Design a protein around this nucleic acid. Sequence first.
DNA 1: TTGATAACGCTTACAA
DNA 2: TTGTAAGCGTTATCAA
Lengths: 332, 332, 87, 87
Amino acid sequence: MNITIYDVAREANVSMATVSRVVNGNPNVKPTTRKKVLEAIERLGYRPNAVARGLASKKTTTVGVIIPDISSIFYSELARGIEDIATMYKYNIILSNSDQNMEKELHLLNTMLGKQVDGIVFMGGNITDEHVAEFKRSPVPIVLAASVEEQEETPSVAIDYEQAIYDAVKLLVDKGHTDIAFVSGPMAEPINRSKKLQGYKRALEEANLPFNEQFVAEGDYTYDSGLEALQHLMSLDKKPTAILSATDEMALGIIHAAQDQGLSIPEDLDIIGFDNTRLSLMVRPQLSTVVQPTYDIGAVAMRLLTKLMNKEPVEEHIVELPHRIELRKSTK
Amino acid sequence: MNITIYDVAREANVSMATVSRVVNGNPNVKPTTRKKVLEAIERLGYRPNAVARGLASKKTTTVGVIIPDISSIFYSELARGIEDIATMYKYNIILSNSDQNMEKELHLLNTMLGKQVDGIVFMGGNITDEHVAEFKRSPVPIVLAASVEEQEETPSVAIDYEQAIYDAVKLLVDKGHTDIAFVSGPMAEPINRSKKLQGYKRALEEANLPFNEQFVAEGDYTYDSGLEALQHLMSLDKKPTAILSATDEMALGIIHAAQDQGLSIPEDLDIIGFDNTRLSLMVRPQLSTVVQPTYDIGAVAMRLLTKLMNKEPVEEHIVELPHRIELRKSTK
Amino acid sequence: AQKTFKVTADSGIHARPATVLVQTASKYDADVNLEYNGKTVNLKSIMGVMSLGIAKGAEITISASGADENDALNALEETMKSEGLGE
Amino acid sequence: AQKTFKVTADSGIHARPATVLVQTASKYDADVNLEYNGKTVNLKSIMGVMSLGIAKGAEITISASGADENDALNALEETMKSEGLGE
DNA sequence: TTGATAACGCTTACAA
DNA sequence: TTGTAAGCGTTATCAA
């Protein structure tokens, strides 16, 4: 049974009211009184009950984070940013996994809003209108991170994926490649279908190259899918000379699946991954990837949320951080 | 004033108690009523406030989680285990990184106790007599996860690191090896200095093989510290024939580093990693490793905490989960 | 009820998959157990199932007795192969 | 006061280090700024610093102008070399 | 500067 | 079945 501000007020012949003022460093408190109750608290080892405070102040200095799978090398990186900038601004966090399950996502949202979070950072592969509905119904700000929202209604922080895949695809053409394949993530998700797959087709038709509906493999972000993807693209009568994966993890599957088939990277084929995760530095040959400031994305987003929670004016709720490419040994 | 349990009552023409019973699914509501109120709830857009629930009930259905760094391939996986068993038991989690900074740890502990968590799961690398003292005088139950505590008087769940290394070194010894090295983790943390290392030194003594200082390399969990450990060992006049890494990440550094010096794993060097993470598989050759049910650690730890939060009896506060070596191709 | 399988899953009976198996058995009234070459634990207990360390190439015996002790054994068998665990 | 550095960092001004540089510029009352490629942003603002996209190679220019614009610029240099972000 | 005293939103005996 | 009312620990509004 923790000690309340009443025990303190007792141990200092003062009223709960002044203890409260002393705990929040209220100016109008005679220095004699402040230090009297101050030391009093310490003598009692008084730790203020944040829930009780949360009821009265209607503010819990805690934001809720909804993420698909924190065990992921990508998301956990984003979680670090969100978490660092959060602590910076004295904000606690409630992290919950959704696994890209709509039911769970909207449920987590209800749950967090229920515990009175002062804000939310949302990450998901498929934001539907049903989401936007619930989002717009949130009493507290909501910021998206590394996610794609066709509706463009919720403030989000990320990078132009379509542009990114484009820059990559073109770069391969500038080096000669004519038959460039694409290994994507579940097409069910907009980020693959509407953003990455597009930036890929665009670079082609804009490079007069013919779209080959067989150079498009639909992996599932898994290392095995990317492993099973190269085994496929190397069967058709016409096989690619360069492959661009939507994520580094799939990339390794591609590198290896090929190495196991005899062909050696980059000699025979040229590979480019996406995200630039430590996975792309722990591979032989070192993987070239489309860079993405994963931590920055998480950190800029949480910083933006803080600006929205403090109710301070903000320009363009939809931010876009810059992206680049880092070629290594996986490309001649 | 904005849609509280009171407003719902006025609407369904009932008392606050019945609105509270219907909301909690208490089986004592005349169907025609439980319905009348669910109606009101809908029409009013009512959402129960958990904070107020917390104040009243004396618990918040959320636990605390102090992790050194969630962007770690290891700790993150251990986090997904905790989070999944918490959802199982209708519990939320408050995540926060400690970076192993004692100051931060003890502080997070105090914050979370402040936020009135119903329990905490702790993961650190250096539990001092003070940490122990702090834990012992906590209002709510505390449970360590995959951590080492010399004074072993705080419930915890993990594996026997001294035995796991021993088993791994023995295995290699039985394969006829005689000059076995050990690339460890920071000797600061006991897990490395007092467990993994001793497991290593013991296997050698029980084999009558002399201890060779030069065969003990101190990495820092960094894939790169892995590459460097190899270089140093393959730099000695008396090189090792097999190397045991205290971590897979370091092991891949070992494989690739030696792979670059021209050596041919496993033919020229037997390598064995530790953790059996997703990386173990995503390496060529496939990395043989000591399996540690990381996820299970995070899950059995949270499951243990639920028992303790529910003030129920428990057999043994210290729990050791089993381990096993999984040989791949990184070993003859 | 009763049934003996053979863990075919590489990771064995661990992680999420093990979790799912323990939840299923949890929703049925009848008592559910898991016997691994000798020791026997409560399939409705996360600690029990994960303490056996049941790795691939092992044989276990899932038993159920009580009310829904039938639908129980059936649902588990489904989960077993559904989650890609045992045969 | 102001000083120019040349981003030696392999990842440039990003990730944690970036966050560290910003938290340091905030420990001082002075008005710390950071210009790069013809654009100046507050060095205490995570959004500005990380929006520039400073990569390895480029050169920045840390500003300052206040009762402690000195102790600050110095402190800024400390971190600028501690994590290895230019010089 | 202080100190009574309502809110805050909901759980829970204790009653009816 | 359903209503009454006493908390739970802090903040916040008014007077002193």
